[PDB]
Design a protein around this ligand. Structure first.
Ligand SMILES: Nc1nc2c(ncn2[C@@H]2O[C@@H]3COP(=O)(O)O[C@H]4[C@@H](O)[C@H](n5cnc6c(=O)[nH]c(N)nc65)O[C@@H]4COP(=O)(O)O[C@H]3[C@H]2O)c(=O)[nH]1
Ligand SMILES: Nc1nc2c(ncn2[C@@H]2O[C@@H]3COP(=O)(O)O[C@H]4[C@@H](O)[C@H](n5cnc6c(=O)[nH]c(N)nc65)O[C@@H]4COP(=O)(O)O[C@H]3[C@H]2O)c(=O)[nH]1
Length: 166
């Protein structure tokens, strides 16, 4: 019964469990210094999508996003549903430049997608933020903060894009 750890709608890890994994990777880094990156991404114009096509359509968009993610990342990477339309991925042994590759592959897969819903045929995009862990963040939440900041820049910078935290 691994139901305590997963999000019902997407099947991905839930926020609580995913964060525990982020914290575990953070401490592993503090000890060993391996390249490791974090991704935080959101579905673009979600509210508008939800308002326009209905919440059921929105759920399908969320489920498809999770499916694209699940089928596009390594079993050693860890994806989680952080919030309503927000997702996160832990990418161990992966530096910033390498993270951009998997992120772009996901971005493109989503961009080329068509969510066949009962309300209509939808096309959407995602904004993504990447933050490779450095010695600066003093706890895992400050690491998450850097990725979230990169995500905001991606959204404000045009959306349907990947931004790496500098
Ligand atoms: N373009 C690209 N896509 C990536 C990359 N890493 C992961 N993916 C995608 O995400 C899935 C990851 O599978 P996995 O759990 O690592 O499990 C993988 C993997 O562990 C193993 N495998 C396949 N090719 C390689 C490889 O070139 N090197 C290693 N070490 N293992 C491989 O077999 C499974 C095959 O999975 P897939 O059907 O290919 O499905 C793959 C793959 O299409 C990547 O570096 N580049
Ligand atoms: N954590 C994580 N990192 C990722 C992922 N996708 C890409 N990267 C990083 O970014 C580089 C992407 O290389 P690529 O152009 O996809 O070119 C890749 C890829 O196309 C192929 N390859 C490796 N593994 C797989 C695989 O599992 N499935 C498939 N289909 N191809 C693979 O060989 C090349 C191996 O590249 P790398 O030396 O591993 O270096 C990789 C990898 O370390 C991912 O899903 N998760």
């Amino acid at each position: 019964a691994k139901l305590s750890m997963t999000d019902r709608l997407t099947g991905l890890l839930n926020r609580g469990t995913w964060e525990n994994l982020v914290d575990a990777e953070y401490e592993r880094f503090r000890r060993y210094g391996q390249a490791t990156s974090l991704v935080m991404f959101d579905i673009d114009h979600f509210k508008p999508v939800n308002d326009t096509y209905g919440h059921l359509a929105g759920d399908e968009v969320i489920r498809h996003t999770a499916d694209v993610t699940r089928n596009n990342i390594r079993q050693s990477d860890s994806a989680g549903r952080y919030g309503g339309e927000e997702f996160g991925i832990i990418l161990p042994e992966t530096d910033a430049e390498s993270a951009r590759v998997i992120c772009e592959r996901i971005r493109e897969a989503i961009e080329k997608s068509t969510v066949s819903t009962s309300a209509g045929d939808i096309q959407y995009t995602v904004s993504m933020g990447i933050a490779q862990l450095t010695e600066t963040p003093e706890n895992y939440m400050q690491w998450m903060q850097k990725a979230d900041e990169a995500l905001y820049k991606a959204k404000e910078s045009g959306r349907n894009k990947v931004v790496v935290s500098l």
